[PDB]
Design an enzyme around this catalytic site. Structure first.
Site: not given
Ligand SMILES: NC(=O)c1ccc[n+]([C@@H]2O[C@H](COP(=O)([O-])OP(=O)(O)OC[C@H]3O[C@@H](n4cnc5c(N)ncnc54)[C@H](OP(=O)(O)O)[C@@H]3O)[C@@H](O)[C@H]2O)c1
Length: 416
Positions: A102, A142, A216-221
């Site tokens: 980690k 992470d 939970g509807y994030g990327n994984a969800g």
């Molecule tokens: N080089 C690359 O490949 C690259 C570079 C940059 C980004 N990316 C992609 O861009 C994405 C960046 O966004 P992320 O992954 O941070 O998205 P996420 O964490 O799933 O959520 C997007 C934002 O919304 C908030 N959030 C938390 N829980 C949520 C929910 N249940 N529903 C809606 N919004 C929620 C989060 O902030 P809080 O949780 O603090 O409220 C977060 O900043 C990544 O998944 C990645 O794959 C790729």
């Protein structure tokens, strides 16, 4: 204090279900290596600010440690140690030649610019080079880390190493252009879907047209809900963000739900559907329940109302042990937390194998290998759960710690 104590308590609970020597348990209590370093960077204003970085390799008996890096301003050394402890048996259960690692930096990346983030990543690599490597310690994405940052990190590691060995293999989750592997975005969801399908086959229930409720509807969800919808033939009936949850009996297609969320910042008030809070969302009568949201979401209070036949906890420990017991006494098949979301680490292992071997696979081969690994690990855990007659989390923990124990005994670390 709290996270490491929770981790060691969980390890003791897992160990008391099997015959493990006291010396091995004591050894597994203490992580092998802890590296606390000062990471200095030059800010855009010209000032030099130093952060505190931690790299904990909890164990490497089974192989080189694998562990993520978190850039959040709250985690401390104990949190990183506990997460490395979890990574150890998360890679152990999947039967990977990996140890547990980690990484982390006490920093808030919200106010860090792109140049500042790049400098922080490169300086962290410069600080922890002496304890990381392709065959010693592989960092992984992470919280608040993205493939761009670790492409930067791999570039810095390659610059330091002078391109003597497989630099691409030092770190995983890299962009597809430079050392990346197919299926990284869908890794956790693909592993969760494979585990759900295997659990259904174990229970003998067909998933054609069944109901899945995902919290939970994030990327994984989102990817889990989608992969369920097409691959499993499942009818998605519940998706929730931090605002609220959406219900419709006939079914939901995650694509337009994601479009709505991106358009208006939330899935609230989806067309042709009703709004229900996550608390009553966990009370739905469905076939599959997938908590993919904030941890400790299922508690002892609402565990009695859970009715889904199979629950697959994608999130890290979203179900309390008491609620876990109440689900056990209800005949509910529950996939362990570190077994459901192990798709990400399995795909990272595949990426590392591709990097070290110099051969890059297509998404088909990666998906097939992930399917095979998930099937083998899940059925090993399932057979243990029947044989020892203990809950599924405890079976997975027994399998993982037994593998680690065997690795330690083979290396001669423990003579008992
Ligand atoms: N080089 C690359 O490949 C690259 C570079 C940059 C980004 N990316 C992609 O861009 C994405 C960046 O966004 P992320 O992954 O941070 O998205 P996420 O964490 O799933 O959520 C997007 C934002 O919304 C908030 N959030 C938390 N829980 C949520 C929910 N249940 N529903 C809606 N919004 C929620 C989060 O902030 P809080 O949780 O603090 O409220 C977060 O900043 C990544 O998944 C990645 O794959 C790729």
């Amino acid at each position: 204090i709290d996270p490491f104590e929770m981790a060691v308590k969980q390890l003791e609970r897992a160990a008391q279900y099997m015959d493990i020597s006291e010396e091995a348990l004591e050894w597994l209590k203490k992580p092998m290596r802890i590296v606390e370093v000062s990471v200095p960077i030059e800010m855009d204003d010209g000032s030099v600010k130093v952060f505190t970085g931690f790299r904990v390799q909890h164990n490497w008996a089974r192989g080189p440690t694998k562990g993520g890096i978190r850039w959040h301003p709250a985690e401390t050394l104990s949190t990183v140690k506990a997460l490395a402890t979890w990574m150890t048996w998360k890679v152990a259960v999947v039967d990977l030649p990996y140890g547990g690692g980690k990484g982390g930096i006490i920093v808030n990346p919200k106010e860090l610019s792109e140049r500042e983030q790049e400098r922080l990543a490169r300086a962290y690599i410069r600080a922890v080079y002496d304890v990381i490597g392709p065959w010693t310690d592989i960092p992984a994405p992470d919280v608040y880390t993205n493939p761009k940052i670790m492409g930067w990190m791999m570039d810095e590691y390659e610059t330091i190493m002078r391109r003597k060995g497989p630099a691409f293999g030092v770190i995983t989750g890299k962009p597809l252009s430079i050392g990346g592997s197919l299926g990284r975005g869908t890794a956790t969801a693909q592993g969760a879907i494979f585990t759900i399908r295997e659990a259904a086959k174990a229970l003998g229930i067909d998933l054609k047209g069944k109901k899945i409720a995902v919290q939970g509807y994030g990327n994984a969800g989102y990817y889990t809900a989608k992969l369920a919808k097409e691959q499993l033939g499942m009818t998605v009936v519940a998706v929730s963000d931090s605002r609220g949850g959406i219900y419709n009996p006939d079914g939901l297609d995650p694509d337009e739900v994601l479009k709505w969320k991106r358009e208006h910042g939330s899935v609230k008030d989806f067309p042709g559907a009703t709004n229900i809070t996550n608390e009553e969302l966990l009370e739905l009568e469905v076939d599959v329940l997938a908590p993919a949201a904030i941890e400790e979401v299922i508690t002892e209070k609402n565990a009695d109302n859970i009715k889904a036949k199979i629950v697959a906890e994608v999130a890290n420990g979203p179900v309390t042990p008491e609620a876990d017991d109440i689900l056990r006494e209800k005949g509910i098949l529950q996939i362990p937390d570190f077994l459901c979301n192990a798709g990400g680490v399995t795909v990272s292992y595949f990426e590392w194998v591709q990097n070290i071997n110099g051969y890059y696979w297509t998404e088909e081969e990666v998906r097939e290998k992930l399917d095979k690994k998930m099937t083998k690990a899940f059925w090993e855990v399932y057979n243990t759960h029947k044989d020892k007659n203990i809950h599924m989390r405890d079976a997975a923990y027994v399998v993982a710690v037994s593998r680690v124990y065997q690795a330690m005994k083979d290396r001669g670390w423990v003579k008992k």
